[PDB]
Amino acid sequence: KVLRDNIQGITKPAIRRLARRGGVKRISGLIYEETRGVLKVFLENVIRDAVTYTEHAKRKTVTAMDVVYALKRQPRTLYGFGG
Amino acid sequence: ALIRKLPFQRLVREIAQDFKTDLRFQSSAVMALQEASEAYLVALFEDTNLCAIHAKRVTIMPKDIQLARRIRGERA
Amino acid sequence: SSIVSLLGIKVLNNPAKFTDPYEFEITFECLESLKHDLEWKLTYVGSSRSLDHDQELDSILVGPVPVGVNKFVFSADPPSAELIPASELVSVTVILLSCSYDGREFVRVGYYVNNEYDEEELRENPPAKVQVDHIVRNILAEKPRVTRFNIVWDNGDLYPP
């Protein structure tokens, strides 16, 4: 609706590079806005945790080790059993 | 490497601005987020592609990303 | 770290008719006595647009859990077509096998499942009335996507859920 809602952190050529990196060959035009919404949910989840850690440590700024720990709290998906 | 740093950094600030006013990230913190985001999207696109291939299509659709999120067991 | 870990899953009847039951052999390991129950659930994703169309197909509740390697076969009834949005019935989707300990989910296994008409003329010219009896399903059994979640079993997180 308004400009702030539509701020993005990844360009269309960047989404095309990432899709190629993932072995994709062709995309629908709707992929751009779908990828962006998915990136946003990921970022919100990690940043919420990173910020919590930052606040409990009373730090001035969010540090690499708050983010690194927040990332460890994200589930990992593997390709078979045992890993 | 694959995505530009400044647009990404601004998006991070805008999301942060919901959880905590003028809390800033160190540049190495933003960089770690940026690398994780790329690796996350690349992996998502791999499953998205696998979905399309199993559907016997070559063009990935929003439904392929939606299903790849289900099969990666993202807790909606 | 996990007291129960899943060791393997075999998809026994594949490819199959849309209306055939799903047969699985599940193998898991339980390393020490647990107080509570394990629960295995099989969910069919009815629509990629929302969780509202998920169909739970089966649920196996086991308690107490026997210690050691556990192996078991089960047969789950297929989803019902009437509940699936028409435009998504005959296309690819996902099924999910999850397990929970005392109601806390610790592992989820996803597979892609393609649905396709069994004959040329229907494939090229699908009918307005979905003919369920001609739908064949194919589970990508060679590519399980396995996701683990840390949970509390029977017991020091400083930022707990």
Author numbering:
A (entry chain C): 20 to 102
B (entry chain B): 60 to 135
C (entry chain A): 1 to 155, 159 to 164
The authors write:
In the Asf1-H3/H4 complex, the C terminus of H4 forms an antiparallel β sheet with the globular core of Asf1.
The Asf1 C-terminal tail is shifted toward H4 and has a large RMSD of 1.58 Å, when compared to the WT complex. Overall, histone H4 has an RMSD of 0.46 Å, but the RMSD of the C-terminal tail alone (H4 92 to 101) is 1.35 Å, whereas the core of the protein excluding the tail has an RMSD of 0.29 Å. This increases the distance between the globular core of Asf1 and the histones, while at the same time bringing the Asf1 C-terminus toward H4. Thus, the overall structure of the Asf1-H3/H4G94P complex differs from the WT complex, and this is largely due to the changes in the H4 C-terminus from the inability of the proline to adopt the same conformation as Gly94 of H4.
